[PDB]
C-alpha cells in the first residue's frame, strides 16, 4: 500500500502523485529538496503521507523505516543540462540511484526510475541499445551509466525494474523549472510579456528553429509509469516519447496560434509569425556546441512490445491543450 | 509535572510561559533559538526549568532527559512567512514538528502546536477541511502538511493532539518580530516616528487598506491553550480567531486614536485620518504578488463545538489596550 | 514683419510659433537651447526664418543683425522649479530678460514676454500688485523681481510692453519638459504604461490630491498673447489664468475617464478610481516642502479691463481635448 515518490516537487514527480492521488492512492512518501521553494505549489492539490529531502531519504528507506512499500518511483535528480560539478552530478544521479535500487531490490518494491534520450546523444538510432548511447554531457552520462547499471542487475532481478527514457517533456508543473523549462512554457511566458516566441537559429546543419525533437505530453509520460506500476510482472528500459519527431518550430507556431485565438485572432502559418515578429530566432550559444541534440525520435518498438498501446497526444492537441491551462490564471 | 514550551523565546510562546506562571505552572522547559538576543526579554518576568537551544532538544527529549512531561506547547517554527529556503523552512517547522509529535505519542504527552491560517491561502471559506487548504507559500506549506499528518495519526492517538491555526495576532511580547510582527505594533512605532501610519494600497481587486483579516490577541490566544490543556479529552485541528473580519484600515484607524487620545486629541474618522496625512499607502510589493492572503475569517463553529464558548476581544478593545501597553515605556 | 520668438522650440513658445503660422506670420527668428534634442519636434509643422541658441542671440539682436523687428515674444527662460543655482536662474532669467527688454526699448519693438503665477508665492490675493508677491523659490524670485523692473520702466516707454502671469498651461508640445510638464501629461503617460496615475497626497492642510490650481491650455495662452500682439496701444503685467481653480484630482480623474471613454469603460468619480487603484498617493517629497503653492487663482480684473473678454476652455473641456490629441499616436 505505501508508494515513495522522489523528485515528488518536481515536474514529472508531482505529475506522478497527481495522478496516483486520481485513482485514490494516497499513502506517498514525497521526496524532493525544496532549497528553491516555489516547487511547493506543485503538491498543493496532493495528498502524501510524508515528506522528506533527498539527504535524509536512503538511509531511512534502507532502515525500514517506512515500512512495507509497493513501488518507488524514483523521479529524482539534477536535471540542469548545464550543471559543470560532475562529482554532484554523479553523487545526486548514478550513485543515489544506485543506493534507491540497491534498496527496492532489497525488499521487494517495485523500481520504476526516470532515464534520459540525452543518453542518445547525437545518435540516428534510438533504439534501447548499447551499441547507439553516447551522450554529450554529463548529465546525460550520470543517466546512460545508471542504464547501465540497471542492464546488469536486471536479468537477476526477481522484483520489478522499469525505467523510462523521457524525450522532450512538456505540460503542467514545470513552472518552477527556468531555463530547463520546456520550450512551450517559455514561448508561453515570452508571448504574455513582448507578444513574442524566441527559439534558436541555425546550428550544425538545421535551419532557425528546423531543430527537431520528440515532445510528449506529462500525461502520458503519467499514463505510461502506471501502466508498469500495474504490471509488475514487466521490466526494462523504455523509450517514452511519441515516435513523431516535429521541429522547434511547431512549438512556437501552435503556442501563438493557440493564444491568439483565445483572444479572437485567426490562426498564422509558421511563415506569417516570422514576417510579422511573432516568432524570431536568437543565435545558438556557443556554450551548447557539441552538447546539444539536433535531432531526437523515439522507436516505439519495445514500449509497444510489452502491451502500452494507447495513442499519445500529439503536439497540436497537446501543447495546445497546455496553453489553455497556463492561460488559466486570468 | 514537566512542562515544554518551544517557541518559548518569542511572541506567543512566552505569552504562554507568562500565562502558565500566572496559575503556578512554573516547572517549564523552554526552547528557543536566541541568535537574536533582543528575544530574552521575553522571559525576564517569568519562571522556568530550563533553557535549550532548539537544536539540542529533539535528542534530549526522547531520551527522556527531562523526565515525565506533561504536556509540550510547540510554538517554535519559523515565523518569516517570506522565508525562501523551503529545505530550512519543511526541516525546521514540519520534520521538526513531527519529532516533537512522535515523542509526544511515545511518551503520552499532550501535544498542543501551533497551525496557521495561512494553510487556507486564497480560499473563500476557512473551516477546518482539506477541500478549502491552499497555502500560498512555502510557510504555509510546512504548516499544511504537518496538519496533513496531524489527521492520519489522531485516530489512531492515545494521547492529546491539540493544532491551532491561529489567525492575525497581535498583542505585548512580539517586539523582536521585526518586519513580522503585527501591523498594529507596526503603526505604533510609525507614528511614534513619523507622526503617520502606512498600509497597503490596492491590490487584487481589495482598495486601500480595505484586505481583511480576522486579528485575536495573544489573550484569546493564550487563554485558547489553557483550556485545552485542562482538557485531555479534547484533541483536534481547531481555527483560532474571532470570526469578526476587519480590514487593516480599522487597526490603523485605531492606532491613531488610541494615540491621540494619550496626547488629548480628538478620535478622527478613517476619511478625515487619510485627508490629514495621519494614514498613506505605500504601493503593494512586488514580493508579495499572489503570495498574500486578501481575506481571512475564522469559522468558529468546530471552536465552539468543543466547549469554548467565551467570547474574543475586538479590535477597538485589544488593539486600544495593546498601544496603551506599548506608550508605557517612558 | 520680422518676429522674434526666445524659447520657440519649448512649449508655450512652439505654441506661439504655430499659430502665428496660421495666421501668415513665418518671418520668424526662433531662439531656444536644442542641447535635449527633443523640442526639435516641437517646431517640424512650422515656418521660420532663422534658429539660435540663446547664447549667441542677444548680442546680435542689439547690434541689429535682424533687421526691422516688429515684435518678440519672450518665452525663453530656465522653467526647472527645482534648479537650485540661483546664480544660473538669475542670469539665464531676469539678466536675459533684461537686455532682451533695453534691446527692444531702443529699436522700439513689442516686448511680449512671460513671467508666472509662481511669483504670488503661498498669498491668498492673486492680483497684479507688489504688496502680494512673495515667491517662494529662486525660480520665482527671477520672474518676481523681473516684473518689479517692468513697472519701473513701464510709465515712460514708448512702446509695447506686455507680461503675462501664466498659471498651470498644459497642451501639445510639452512633451519634452520631463518631471517639469503638466500634471494631466505625466497623468496620460503614467496611465499607459500602468493603468494608474499619481498624485502628491497631504501637504501643509491639504489633503491626498487636494491641493488646487488654475489650469488653462495653451490654445488660450496663444489667444491672449495674440491679441495683445494685436494692440501694441496696450501695455501692461496681467494674470493669465481662467479665475476658476481645480484640485489635481480633478485633473487626475478626468485623464483617467477620458482614457476610459476611449478604451469603451464607463466614467468613475475620484472615490471609484482611488478605491480601485487608478489613482494613487505619492508621498510629499521634502525637497518641496516650503516651496510650493498649494492654491492658485487668476483674479481676472486686469486681464478683463484690458479687453479680452473671451471665454477660457475649463479644465473638462481643455484636458479631453489634450487626452484625445494624446492619444493620436497609435
Ligand atoms: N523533458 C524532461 O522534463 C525530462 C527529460 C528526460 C529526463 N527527465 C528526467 O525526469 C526526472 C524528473 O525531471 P523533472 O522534469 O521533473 O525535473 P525537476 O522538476 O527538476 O524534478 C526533480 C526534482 O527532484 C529534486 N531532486 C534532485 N535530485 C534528487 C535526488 N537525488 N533525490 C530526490 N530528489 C531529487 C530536484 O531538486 P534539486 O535538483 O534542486 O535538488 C527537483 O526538484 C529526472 O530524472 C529527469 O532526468 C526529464
Ligand atoms: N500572527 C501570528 O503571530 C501567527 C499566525 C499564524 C501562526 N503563528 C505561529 O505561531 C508560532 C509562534 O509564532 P510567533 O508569533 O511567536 O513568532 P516567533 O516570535 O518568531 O516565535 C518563534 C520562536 O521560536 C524560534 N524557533 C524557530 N524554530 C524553532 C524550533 N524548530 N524549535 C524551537 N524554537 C524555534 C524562533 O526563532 P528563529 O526563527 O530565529 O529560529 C522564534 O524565536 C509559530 O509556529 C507560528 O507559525 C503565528
Ligand atoms: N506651467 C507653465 O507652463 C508656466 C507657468 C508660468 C510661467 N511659464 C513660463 O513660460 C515660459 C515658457 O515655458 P515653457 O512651459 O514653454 O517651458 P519650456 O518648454 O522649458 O520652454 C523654454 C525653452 O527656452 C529655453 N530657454 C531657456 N532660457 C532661455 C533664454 N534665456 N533664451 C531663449 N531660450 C531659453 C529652454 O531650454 P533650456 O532651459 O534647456 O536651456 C527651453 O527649451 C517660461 O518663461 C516659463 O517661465 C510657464
Chains 1, 2, 3 share one sequence.
Not at 29 to 51: G, W
Request: net charge negative; aromatic share 14%; with cysteine.
Amino acid at each position: 500500500m505505501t508508494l515513495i515518490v522522489t523528485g515528488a516537487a518536481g515536474f514529472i514527480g508531482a505529475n506522478l502523485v497527481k495522478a496516483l492521488n486520481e485513482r485514490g492512492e494516497t499513502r506517498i512518501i514525497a521526496v524532493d529538496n525544496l532549497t528553491r521553494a516555489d516547487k511547493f505549489k506543485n503538491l498543493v492539490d496532493c495528498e502524501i503521507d510524508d515528506y522528506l529531502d533527498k539527504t535524509e531519504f536512503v538511509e531511512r528507506f534502507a532502515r525500514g523505516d517506512f515500512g512495507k512499500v509497493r513501488a518507488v518511483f524514483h523521479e529524482g535528480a539534477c536535471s540542469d543540462t548545464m550543471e559543470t560539478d560532475g562529482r554532484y552530478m554523479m553523487d545526486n544521479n548514478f550513485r543515489y540511484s544506485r543506493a534507491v535500487l540497491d534498496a527496492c531490490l532489497a525488499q521487494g518494491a517495485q523500481f520504476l526510475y526516470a532515464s534520459s534520450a540525452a543518453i542518445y546523444g547525437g545518435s540516428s538510432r534510438f533504439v534501447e541499445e548499447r551499441e547507439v548511447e553516447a551522450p554529450l554531457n554529463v548529465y546525460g552520462y550520470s543517466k546512460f551509466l545508471f542504464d547501465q547499471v540497471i542492464r546488469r542487475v536486471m536479468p537477476g532481478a526477481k522484483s520489478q525494474i522499469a525505467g523510462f527514457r523521457y524525450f522532450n517533456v512538456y505540460g503542467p508543473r514545470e513552472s518552477h523549472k527556468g531555463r530547463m523549462a520546456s520550450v512551450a512554457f517559455h514561448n508561453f511566458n515570452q508571448f504574455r510579456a513582448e507578444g513574442k516566441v524566441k527559439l534558436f537559429g541555425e546550428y550544425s546543419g538545421y535551419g532557425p528553429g528546423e531543430q527537431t525533437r520528440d515532445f510528449v505530453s506529462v500525461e502520458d509520460v503519467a499514463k505510461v509509469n502506471l501502466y508498469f506500476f500495474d504490471h509488475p510482472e514487466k521490466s526494462g528500459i523504455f523509450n517514452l516519447g511519441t515516435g513523431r519527431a516535429q521541429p522547434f518550430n511547431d512549438i512556437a507556431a501552435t503556442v501563438v496560434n493557440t493564444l491568439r485565438a483565445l483572444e479572437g485572432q485567426p490562426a498564422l502559418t509558421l511563415a506569417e509569425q516570422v514576417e510579422q515578429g511573432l516568432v524570431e530566432y536568437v543565435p545558438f550559444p556557443d556554450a551548447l556546441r557539441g552538447k546539444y541534440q539536433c535531432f531526437t525520435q523515439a522507436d516505439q518498438t519495445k514500449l509497444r512490445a510489452a502491451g502500452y498501446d494507447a495513442p499519445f497526444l500529439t503536439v497540436q492537441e497537446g501543447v495546445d491543450r497546455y496553453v489553455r491551462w497556463l492561460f488559466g490564471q486570468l
